[PDB]
Structures are given as C-alpha cells and as structure tokens.
DNA sequence: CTAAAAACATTCGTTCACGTGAGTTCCAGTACAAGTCTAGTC
DNA sequence: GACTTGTACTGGAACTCACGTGAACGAATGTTTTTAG
C-alpha cells in the first residue's frame, strides 16, 4: 500500500482538508528489459547526446 | 592540408568512436588536418570531459614511446576545437584551453640548539602552568608540541608550516599564530605575570617540594620564601635541607665542577672496590654545558660483584666529609648534596648515584641518559606499536616470558626497529 | 477516356527513450561520550 | 589538550512507482495521382 499523492481538498479558501489518493486498480506490465553486452552479458547504459 | 602548421589529434577513451568520427569528418570538411594515429607530427591534442591531472597521465605514457628531443604537444580541450570549427579558423590558445615528522619523538632527532627558541620557551611556560594547575595531559601535550617545534630543520615563519606537524591542535596553533603575528603572545604574558605561577615556580625549586606541597602552601597563605623560614616545624628533612642551601642549589652547574666531582667519585669507587667503572649520564651526556645536578652510573664489567657497592662508597665519602645530605641519613639509588670546595669556600651541588649490573647496564644507560620526554615517548612507542614493555632494567615481552637483554645500547634500538640516535640528538 | 497500380495521408497499438514528481528506506557523514597519556623507588 | 575508540542521530540519496512527451515501426485502411491500353 502506498499513497500516490497527499492533496488538499478546498471547500473554500479558508476550509482545507488533507486527503490521500490511491490506485485500487492498476494495469500490470512486464518488467522493463535491460540491455546486456553480447560478449560478456555485462549490463550496459544508454547515454543521449545532442550536438 | 590548408594549414600546414596545424596537426590535430583526438582521443578515443572518453569521446567515443562515434563522436571521434563525427569530429574528424567535420574538421576534414573544414580543411583541417587530423591525424588518424598519434605521431610526432601531432602539434595539439584535444581531450573531452577529462580532468587535467588525468590528461597528464595520458601525455607521459606517450612521451616514453617518442624519440628524445621532440617538442611535446600542447594539451587542449574540446572547447578549443569547437570554437575553431565555429569561427572557421584556429582560435588563439588561452588559459582555459591549456613517514613525515613521526608523532613519536623517538623517530625524529632533536638537536640541543634549535631555531625556535622563543616558541619553545612559550610552550614550556604554558606546560609548566598546566602542570601547576594539576592537568598532566595538558603538560604532556604542550611538551610534545614544544619538542615538535624543536626538531624543525628550518625556522618557522608562516603558519602554513604547522599543517603537517603532529600534536598541533587549535590551542597550540593559536598560540604560535599570536607569537608570530604580534611577537609577544597575550596568553603567555597573562599566565606568566600571574602571581600564582611565580610563587609556584619559586616553591618548586626548593629541594623536596613538589607541586602538591607548593599548592598546599599557596592556599595556606604562604607567599614568600622568608615566610617558610618563619615556621621551621612543618618541613621534613628534604625541605629543610633544600631551603637552607637555596642559593647554592639555585646556581646552574658548570663543566669544571662536573669534572672535579667525577674525579672525586672515581677515586672513591676505585678505593672502595677495584675495577669499578663510572659513567656520566643525564643532561651532561647529551652535550649540555649547564645543568641542575650531576648524575652517574656505577657498574662492574665482571658479573655479580656490585651487591652492596653503593652503601660502602657513600659511607666512605661521608667519612671523607663531603655529603651534606644522604637519602637514607641494600639500595641501588641515592641523591645527595655534595660539598664542593671552590679553588678560591664551597658550594652545594646535587649528585645522584645509581648502580646496575653489566647485564642491565645498557638499559640503565639508555634510561638515565635521554630526556624525560624522549624516554616517555620511547616507552609509549614500545608498549603500543611493538607490544613490548621497556624499563630501566630490561625489555620484556608479555607473550613470551623471556628478557631481551643485550650487550650494547645500539641493539636496544635495533630490536625495536628504530634508527639509532646519539645522546646529543635525544634532547626532548 | 477508363481501369489498375503506385504513392500519400491519417489513425492505432505497441515498444523504447527520456524527464519529473512523490513516497519509503538505507547509509555515510557528523556530533558527542569516554579512555589514555611511562616507569620505578623510597 | 590531542588523539583514539565507540555510540547515537539524521538529512540526503537511492530506489521504486506512476505519469507524460516524443519518436519509430508495423500495420492497416482509405484516398489521390499517374500511367497503360
Ligand atoms: N619523570 C621521569 N620519567 C622517566 N625518566 C626520567 C624521569 N625523570 C628523569 N628520568 C631519567 C632521564 C633523565 O635524564 C635522568 C635524570 O635526569 P635529571 O637529573 O632528573 N634531569 P637532567 O639532569 O637530565 O637535566 P638538568 O641538568 O636540566 O636538571 O633520569
Ligand atoms: Mg641529574
């Protein structure tokens, strides 16, 4: 269990109540793939350069 | 090449293959000359996202493989190449593009005469004040700082020279800074001018009067030397003897008196037991010209004969009529007040005699020749680093219950893995 | 002049790359407490 | 006072989760233009 955000419901500029938002229904995805060097199966990184 | 006087070489390690290829292609398009492989023809080299120091490491590894006499290229950054490509011509090169003093005093020789007399005197005064206050640790640390300052090969003129010196914290650094910047230090004068310091120094010089007795007298209202003589009923033999011969014992001794006393003691020991050998230890063995007492060590090269030498020699000297004070009026130690007749009359000078067999002779000599601070530091180093216990009698190993006797003092230092120092270099 | 084929335009699901906010937990740094400072004789 | 050892605190970084932007790729479906007979 984890709160996506803790927000403030404002009935009026002077009246504020703290609330928390949760996702009781979330889509399921496969774990992200990770790139590996072919020759040694050592993890690699991707760097983006603009020039 | 449009510019025959320019030869640019890139670096693969950090830039990468693709970036190197693109930059080389762009430079070739712009008419520049780019060398595929490093060679002597290269005049400038460009790095990228590399620290300057690391770049130097690259240069040296390339210098060893080049013929001698070749002018080294000039280090440059990718910014230079980018600016040159953007402006269309090579831009001018600018700045952007382009074991020690061991803590222990036993490891550092300390000559008697140094170039930091004032600072050492101030630190000694502070240490004496701390000792009077009753804090032994403060005295020890101040003495260590003074000793460190004493061993400096060159005079100290700027605070930056105190960084690497051990046993130099906030207080000592501040004291030295005050001494250097303004000359006389405020704290030193404040402590010295204090009446308590002066009266404690006056009382301590009395033979048989320590710090505790001096403080007790100070808190009892006793402030002057004469006041002590007004109540000669709360003083032991030592205090009475010291107070009576105060002026005589206040004068530092000279070397001629040492020679006369040595001759007298040599005659006494020779007549008492034949073959006795006497060695002069203490400050006078370290090269000092002045002292407070004369210290001797008596031994017999043959093993097992100095069982009761000292009482016989002491009683013989007393019969001769020279001992004003004997510690005990079988012992192997005594301090006295000799009666030296001056050639012009006589003056009282203290003399200490200690006996030790030949087996324990080197240890006794080492323990009775070096300074107090040097002995403390050597014993601490032996106990902590090497785990052995060193005392005036011998060196002992808690693990193996066997003594480490030796036939010479050099072996004592050799066993501890320490460079030998002469007696003149053991001053604090 | 008409029909077939090629090219172009728009939409849709999926995967990948990065960036950014929020919540939870670990850890490396900093502060402070306490011990030590030499060894012996008398 | 200076150093060494041990304990406690704690603010930030790392990690995870979730969403949004931008791009490529296949894939489709439809629509428009060009060329052959
Ligand atoms: N507290 C101590 N701890 C260890 N060893 C010590 C010691 N005190 C002395 N020794 C050792 C080392 C000492 O060298 C020796 C006795 O020396 P002194 O006669 O007490 N003082 P000196 O004659 O050297 O100098 P000056 O003429 O200025 O008074 O015993
Ligand atoms: Mg002496």
XYZ file of C-alpha atoms (C1' of nucleotides) and ligand atoms in Angstrom:
589
model
C 0.000 0.000 0.000
C 1.255 3.450 -0.975
C -0.354 6.853 -1.481
C 0.083 8.280 -4.972
C -0.243 11.804 -3.579
C -1.296 13.719 -0.474
C -3.506 16.581 -1.651
C -5.687 19.269 -0.078
C -9.422 19.375 -0.753
C -10.553 23.010 -0.582
C -14.230 23.552 0.164
C -13.302 27.237 0.473
C -10.156 29.355 0.555
C -10.328 29.099 4.367
C -11.517 25.468 4.670
C -8.944 22.811 3.749
C -8.826 19.072 4.479
C -5.896 16.764 3.757
C -6.663 13.650 1.698
C -4.677 10.857 0.077
C -5.090 9.333 -3.381
C -4.681 5.607 -4.035
C -4.971 3.319 -7.064
C -7.049 0.273 -6.142
C -6.853 -0.808 -9.811
C -3.562 -0.502 -11.718
C -2.532 -2.037 -15.028
C 0.166 -4.718 -14.942
C 3.175 -4.544 -17.262
C 6.163 -6.767 -17.886
C 9.332 -5.735 -16.022
C 11.371 -3.347 -18.186
C 14.051 -5.060 -20.284
C 17.704 -4.307 -19.557
C 20.393 -4.181 -22.230
C 23.336 -6.565 -21.918
C 26.594 -6.798 -23.822
C 26.546 -9.899 -26.006
C 30.135 -10.995 -25.399
C 30.132 -10.922 -21.580
C 26.478 -10.463 -20.504
C 27.548 -7.333 -18.590
C 24.926 -4.580 -18.144
C 25.360 -1.504 -20.334
C 23.923 2.013 -20.223
C 22.409 4.331 -22.822
C 23.503 7.975 -22.970
C 21.818 10.585 -25.168
C 23.912 13.404 -26.641
C 22.686 16.358 -28.704
C 25.254 18.436 -30.581
C 46.196 20.410 -45.709
C 45.195 24.068 -45.933
C 47.027 24.842 -42.674
C 50.412 23.071 -42.955
C 51.353 24.366 -39.494
C 48.454 22.672 -37.664
C 48.131 18.970 -36.820
C 45.264 17.922 -34.539
C 44.914 14.538 -32.834
C 41.816 13.484 -30.899
C 41.457 10.938 -28.082
C 39.190 7.869 -28.068
C 38.954 6.997 -24.330
C 36.256 9.480 -23.269
C 34.913 10.963 -26.516
C 33.947 7.604 -28.021
C 34.117 6.189 -31.521
C 31.068 7.942 -32.986
C 31.960 11.365 -31.577
C 35.569 10.996 -32.721
C 34.457 10.027 -36.227
C 31.996 12.917 -36.484
C 34.522 15.477 -35.231
C 37.206 14.150 -37.578
C 34.822 14.330 -40.528
C 33.772 17.878 -39.673
C 37.388 19.003 -39.275
C 38.334 17.363 -42.578
C 35.440 19.161 -44.267
C 36.639 22.462 -42.766
C 40.111 21.937 -44.273
C 41.846 20.965 -41.026
C 44.467 18.213 -40.771
C 43.513 15.359 -38.425
C 45.954 12.523 -37.753
C 44.423 9.049 -37.643
C 47.148 7.768 -35.296
C 49.280 9.585 -32.748
C 52.707 10.584 -34.046
C 55.426 13.179 -33.582
C 53.794 15.239 -36.342
C 50.897 15.998 -33.988
C 51.160 19.507 -32.534
C 47.980 19.713 -30.428
C 45.832 17.107 -28.675
C 42.220 17.535 -27.541
C 40.528 15.751 -24.636
C 36.884 15.853 -23.537
C 35.258 15.669 -20.095
C 38.611 14.697 -18.571
C 40.303 16.185 -15.527
C 43.567 17.996 -16.198
C 45.632 15.680 -13.990
C 44.306 12.585 -15.759
C 45.219 14.166 -19.097
C 48.810 14.499 -17.884
C 48.849 10.749 -17.258
C 47.984 10.263 -20.929
C 50.818 12.550 -22.043
C 53.527 10.778 -20.042
C 52.537 7.335 -21.320
C 53.049 8.789 -24.811
C 56.376 10.501 -24.060
C 58.177 7.262 -23.169
C 57.483 5.880 -26.662
C 58.647 9.009 -28.541
C 62.223 9.780 -29.620
C 64.055 12.236 -27.364
C 64.178 15.887 -28.354
C 60.651 16.022 -29.794
C 58.668 19.040 -28.624
C 55.668 17.749 -26.618
C 52.239 18.708 -27.985
C 50.008 21.174 -26.157
C 47.072 19.849 -24.152
C 43.721 21.268 -25.247
C 40.015 20.830 -24.548
C 37.176 20.047 -26.938
C 36.041 23.646 -26.426
C 39.063 24.825 -28.419
C 38.237 22.555 -31.359
C 34.551 23.503 -31.318
C 35.400 27.214 -31.244
C 37.889 26.768 -34.087
C 35.315 24.933 -36.204
C 32.634 27.528 -35.479
C 34.831 30.545 -36.213
C 36.350 28.867 -39.280
C 39.970 29.400 -38.191
C 42.166 28.114 -35.344
C 41.313 30.372 -32.408
C 44.170 31.628 -30.196
C 45.027 29.304 -27.321
C 44.045 30.713 -23.920
C 44.275 29.644 -20.286
C 41.002 27.694 -20.335
C 42.115 25.529 -23.261
C 45.526 24.865 -21.693
C 56.896 8.784 7.264
C 56.954 12.587 7.540
C 57.577 14.013 11.017
C 56.541 10.936 13.033
C 54.391 11.691 16.058
C 56.706 9.849 18.450
C 59.778 11.824 19.497
C 61.882 8.640 19.302
C 61.834 8.692 15.479
C 62.935 12.311 14.882
C 66.375 13.563 16.015
C 66.266 16.666 18.218
C 69.473 18.731 18.369
C 70.147 20.690 21.540
C 70.296 24.048 19.725
C 67.324 24.897 17.502
C 65.964 27.889 15.582
C 62.667 28.151 17.526
C 63.859 29.300 20.945
C 61.037 31.759 21.615
C 58.192 29.445 20.627
C 59.686 26.541 22.575
C 60.102 28.746 25.649
C 56.488 29.918 25.403
C 55.203 26.353 25.056
C 57.346 25.250 28.004
C 55.916 28.083 30.110
C 52.382 27.030 29.178
C 53.214 23.408 30.021
C 54.599 24.433 33.413
C 51.457 26.447 34.141
C 49.278 23.482 33.165
C 51.310 21.153 35.373
C 50.908 23.546 38.289
C 47.162 23.568 37.614
C 47.274 19.775 38.037
C 46.434 18.639 34.485
C 49.125 16.156 33.458
C 47.703 15.619 29.973
C 47.893 19.322 29.150
C 51.532 19.390 30.254
C 52.299 16.305 28.166
C 50.687 17.677 25.003
C 52.352 21.081 25.386
C 55.726 19.394 25.900
C 55.141 17.283 22.788
C 54.288 20.399 20.771
C 57.437 22.136 22.015
C 59.522 19.087 21.101
C 57.970 19.017 17.625
C 58.832 22.685 17.143
C 62.366 21.980 18.385
C 63.099 19.422 15.641
C 62.217 21.631 12.664
C 65.111 21.672 10.151
C 64.369 25.312 9.263
C 62.834 28.231 11.175
C 59.067 28.667 11.069
C 57.966 31.988 9.561
C 54.431 31.261 8.284
C 51.555 29.321 9.819
C 51.360 27.109 6.718
C 54.339 25.132 8.061
C 52.291 23.869 11.037
C 49.870 21.768 8.959
C 51.898 18.552 8.889
C 53.316 18.826 12.403
C 51.583 16.373 14.785
C 50.369 17.278 18.267
C 49.320 20.721 16.991
C 45.629 21.456 17.525
C 43.625 24.629 17.999
C 45.338 25.884 21.159
C 48.959 25.404 20.081
C 48.255 26.721 16.583
C 46.589 29.824 18.026
C 49.486 30.391 20.434
C 52.045 30.129 17.633
C 49.960 32.411 15.407
C 49.783 35.024 18.166
C 53.537 34.759 18.721
C 54.340 35.129 15.017
C 51.868 37.870 14.089
C 52.339 40.263 17.022
C 55.512 38.950 18.675
C 54.731 38.668 22.378
C 51.698 36.457 22.998
C 48.915 37.795 25.208
C 48.123 34.457 26.861
C 51.769 33.705 27.663
C 52.251 37.067 29.371
C 48.925 36.738 31.194
C 49.874 33.343 32.632
C 53.464 34.368 33.410
C 52.645 37.633 35.191
C 50.123 35.769 37.356
C 51.303 35.707 40.963
C 50.318 32.041 41.285
C 52.721 30.984 38.527
C 55.610 32.948 40.036
C 55.051 31.669 43.575
C 54.640 28.079 42.366
C 57.879 28.347 40.387
C 59.627 29.768 43.454
C 58.376 26.974 45.717
C 59.004 24.099 43.296
C 62.709 24.946 43.004
C 63.042 24.045 46.696
C 64.509 20.564 47.020
C 61.898 18.172 48.375
C 58.991 20.473 47.440
C 56.676 19.241 44.693
C 53.583 20.624 43.017
C 51.217 19.317 45.702
C 53.184 20.814 48.598
C 53.609 24.090 46.713
C 49.859 24.319 46.098
C 49.124 23.444 49.729
C 51.411 26.240 50.921
C 49.919 28.652 48.380
C 46.369 28.012 49.600
C 47.572 28.307 53.221
C 48.712 31.923 52.784
C 52.434 31.237 52.314
C 53.608 33.576 49.545
C 57.306 34.365 50.145
C 60.433 32.323 50.786
C 61.143 34.047 54.106
C 57.684 33.103 55.385
C 58.705 29.450 55.054
C 61.680 30.020 57.364
C 59.373 31.570 59.980
C 57.747 28.163 60.673
C 60.520 25.503 60.622
C 58.293 22.815 62.157
C 56.178 21.631 59.183
C 59.156 20.781 56.942
C 60.730 17.343 56.555
C 64.474 16.734 56.218
C 64.392 17.213 52.441
C 62.545 20.534 52.614
C 64.749 21.885 55.412
C 67.942 20.916 53.587
C 66.704 22.445 50.338
C 65.599 25.684 51.985
C 68.851 26.099 53.921
C 71.056 25.703 50.826
C 68.693 27.509 48.469
C 71.149 29.980 46.932
C 73.804 27.299 46.433
C 71.397 24.987 44.591
C 69.826 27.803 42.546
C 73.032 28.379 40.553
C 73.397 26.250 37.394
C 76.437 23.973 37.477
C 79.368 24.217 35.058
C 81.500 21.524 33.438
C 84.550 22.088 35.664
C 82.516 21.145 38.737
C 81.367 18.044 36.857
C 84.982 17.081 36.174
C 86.001 17.603 39.805
C 83.054 15.580 41.111
C 83.751 12.813 38.598
C 87.383 12.630 39.708
C 86.382 12.500 43.383
C 83.769 9.797 42.794
C 86.164 7.797 40.614
C 88.768 7.861 43.380
C 86.170 6.846 45.972
C 84.836 3.929 43.918
C 88.336 2.788 42.974
C 89.436 2.685 46.603
C 86.175 1.030 47.688
C 86.045 -1.739 45.058
C 88.817 -2.196 42.462
C 87.798 -2.221 38.819
C 84.640 -0.150 39.294
C 83.515 1.799 36.223
C 81.568 5.067 36.441
C 79.736 6.661 33.508
C 78.435 10.236 33.420
C 74.768 10.285 32.389
C 71.953 12.818 32.386
C 71.975 16.174 30.674
C 75.770 16.363 30.636
C 75.946 13.244 28.447
C 73.732 14.937 25.832
C 76.135 17.867 25.381
C 74.591 20.345 27.820
C 77.111 22.873 29.253
C 74.889 23.780 32.225
C 72.768 21.630 34.499
C 70.974 21.262 37.812
C 72.625 18.062 39.067
C 75.377 15.597 38.170
C 74.289 12.013 37.508
C 76.453 8.885 37.483
C 76.084 5.152 36.843
C 78.366 2.646 38.590
C 78.937 -0.877 37.288
C 81.474 -3.705 37.276
C 82.279 -5.480 33.972
C 82.564 -8.768 35.857
C 79.194 -10.334 36.638
C 77.893 -10.485 40.197
C 80.095 -8.304 42.406
C 78.238 -4.984 42.897
C 75.931 -6.490 45.513
C 76.438 -3.728 48.085
C 78.768 -1.257 46.392
C 76.719 1.897 46.941
C 76.463 1.843 50.772
C 80.221 1.352 51.113
C 81.100 4.194 48.745
C 78.532 6.505 50.348
C 79.776 5.833 53.882
C 83.387 6.258 52.756
C 82.566 9.626 51.186
C 80.698 10.641 54.345
C 83.805 9.763 56.354
C 85.764 11.961 53.944
C 83.335 14.732 54.919
C 81.555 15.789 51.723
C 77.917 14.598 51.920
C 75.569 17.186 53.406
C 72.516 15.039 52.626
C 72.057 11.315 52.081
C 68.661 9.976 51.042
C 68.866 7.461 53.917
C 70.621 9.634 56.519
C 70.709 -2.665 50.335
C 69.849 0.148 47.916
C 70.920 0.877 44.339
C 69.972 4.557 44.139
C 70.536 7.735 46.138
C 70.527 11.515 45.759
C 72.814 13.749 47.806
C 74.109 17.308 48.178
C 77.890 17.289 47.813
C 80.235 19.800 49.465
C 82.450 21.066 46.649
C 85.421 23.239 47.730
C 85.927 26.029 45.216
C 89.546 26.944 44.366
C 89.120 30.490 45.700
C 84.830 28.364 50.469
C 82.461 25.798 48.971
C 79.150 25.454 47.145
C 76.457 22.780 47.340
C 75.713 20.844 44.138
C 73.445 17.808 43.938
C 74.802 14.432 42.828
C 72.905 11.213 42.085
C 74.419 7.718 42.061
C 72.742 4.632 40.588
C 74.113 1.089 40.339
C 73.236 -1.643 37.853
C 74.854 -4.941 36.786
C 76.608 -5.309 33.452
C 73.664 -7.254 32.019
C 71.294 -4.369 32.812
C 73.938 -1.725 32.051
C 72.773 -0.704 28.534
C 69.159 -0.342 29.662
C 70.168 1.779 32.655
C 72.369 3.968 30.456
C 69.563 4.465 27.937
C 67.034 5.258 30.658
C 69.300 7.652 32.564
C 70.865 9.442 29.564
C 67.859 10.502 27.495
C 65.483 13.323 28.273
C 62.283 12.801 30.239
C 60.070 13.376 27.196
C 62.219 11.169 24.966
C 62.034 8.328 27.488
C 58.265 8.715 27.830
C 57.785 8.676 24.056
C 60.090 5.688 23.557
C 58.321 3.689 26.268
C 54.904 4.569 24.830
C 56.003 3.561 21.326
C 57.429 0.270 22.589
C 54.273 -0.541 24.558
C 51.789 0.382 21.822
C 53.360 -0.394 18.443
C 55.574 -3.403 19.192
C 53.738 -4.512 22.343
C 56.921 -4.838 24.421
C 57.491 -3.274 27.843
C 60.631 -1.151 28.239
C 62.032 -0.017 31.584
C 65.380 0.818 33.157
C 66.061 -2.886 33.832
C 65.224 -4.604 30.542
C 62.835 -5.146 27.660
C 60.105 -7.721 28.296
C 57.568 -9.454 26.055
C 54.175 -10.284 27.631
C 53.612 -13.063 25.082
C 56.925 -14.884 25.588
C 58.186 -14.609 29.177
C 61.815 -14.025 28.225
C 64.006 -10.962 28.664
C 65.612 -9.253 25.665
C 68.987 -8.442 27.234
C 71.738 -7.041 25.006
C 75.435 -6.186 25.184
C 75.100 -2.644 23.788
C 72.631 0.223 23.604
C 72.549 0.063 19.797
C 70.924 -3.373 19.984
C 68.078 -1.947 22.084
C 67.137 0.456 19.293
C 67.772 -2.206 16.643
C 65.320 -4.638 18.252
C 62.540 -2.026 18.303
C 63.059 -1.336 14.592
C 64.200 2.236 15.241
C 67.080 4.202 13.756
C 69.836 4.799 16.290
C 70.278 8.328 17.621
C 73.304 9.645 19.545
C 72.821 11.024 23.068
C 73.142 14.589 21.754
C 70.119 14.013 19.480
C 67.802 12.748 22.251
C 67.034 16.221 23.654
C 63.256 16.062 24.073
C -11.327 8.104 -71.844
C -11.243 4.370 -68.316
C -9.043 0.864 -65.123
C -5.106 -0.814 -62.490
C -1.180 0.160 -59.830
C 1.756 3.100 -57.026
C 2.156 6.628 -53.797
C 0.457 9.539 -49.961
C -2.360 10.700 -45.778
C -4.286 9.654 -41.475
C -5.130 6.622 -37.427
C -3.929 2.944 -33.870
C -1.440 -0.331 -30.876
C 3.000 -1.317 -29.183
C 7.844 -0.601 -27.652
C 11.586 2.388 -26.357
C 13.952 6.632 -24.542
C 13.942 10.353 -21.505
C 12.193 13.601 -17.891
C 9.828 14.707 -13.487
C 7.091 14.359 -9.119
C 6.150 11.681 -4.781
C 6.767 8.140 -1.028
C 9.875 4.792 1.622
C 14.225 3.118 3.326
C 19.261 2.836 3.751
C 23.706 4.843 4.684
C 27.671 7.797 5.046
C 28.657 11.643 7.425
C 28.723 14.342 11.712
C 28.139 15.056 16.646
C 29.219 13.608 21.141
C 30.908 10.364 25.399
C 34.541 8.092 27.372
C 39.528 6.353 27.926
C 44.639 7.385 27.665
C 48.735 9.975 28.334
C 55.972 5.951 31.285
C 58.090 3.623 34.799
C 60.152 2.829 39.134
C 61.947 3.503 44.103
C 61.542 5.054 48.744
C 44.834 19.351 25.046
C 45.297 15.973 21.485
C 44.362 11.523 19.863
C 41.705 7.035 19.590
C 37.608 4.103 20.159
C 32.706 3.516 20.418
C 27.750 5.003 20.179
C 23.861 7.667 18.516
C 21.403 10.767 15.356
C 19.866 12.255 10.881
C 19.462 14.686 6.225
C 20.026 13.378 1.843
C 20.486 9.773 -1.991
C 18.855 5.690 -3.976
C 15.251 3.140 -5.309
C 10.608 2.296 -6.722
C 6.250 3.666 -8.552
C 3.494 6.403 -11.698
C 2.560 9.633 -15.348
C 3.561 12.480 -19.551
C 6.378 13.630 -24.139
C 8.431 12.431 -28.199
C 9.823 9.001 -31.671
C 9.939 4.728 -34.597
C 7.690 0.642 -36.529
C 4.492 -2.161 -38.173
C 0.008 -2.293 -39.655
C -3.996 -1.026 -41.577
C -7.380 1.470 -44.147
C -8.700 4.659 -47.046
C -7.965 8.174 -50.694
C -5.498 10.640 -54.626
C -2.495 10.777 -58.631
C -0.026 8.661 -62.635
C 0.433 5.509 -66.400
C -1.061 1.710 -69.765
C -4.335 0.039 -73.134
N 59.940 11.507 35.185
C 60.827 10.678 34.525
N 60.394 9.650 33.813
C 61.230 8.855 33.180
N 62.529 9.026 33.216
C 63.053 10.027 33.904
C 62.205 10.902 34.593
N 62.986 11.820 35.204
C 64.230 11.570 34.935
N 64.323 10.473 34.139
C 65.554 9.881 33.625
C 66.000 10.629 32.366
C 66.859 11.760 32.961
O 67.846 12.184 32.023
C 67.521 11.057 34.172
C 67.745 12.050 35.313
O 67.866 13.371 34.793
P 67.634 14.677 35.698
O 68.914 14.927 36.636
O 66.437 14.497 36.546
N 67.399 15.996 34.690
P 68.789 16.297 33.803
O 69.983 16.041 34.631
O 68.825 15.352 32.507
O 68.774 17.833 33.352
P 69.021 19.210 34.137
O 70.510 19.418 34.284
O 68.422 20.356 33.354
O 68.376 19.141 35.501
O 66.586 10.047 34.608
Mg 70.667 14.707 37.133
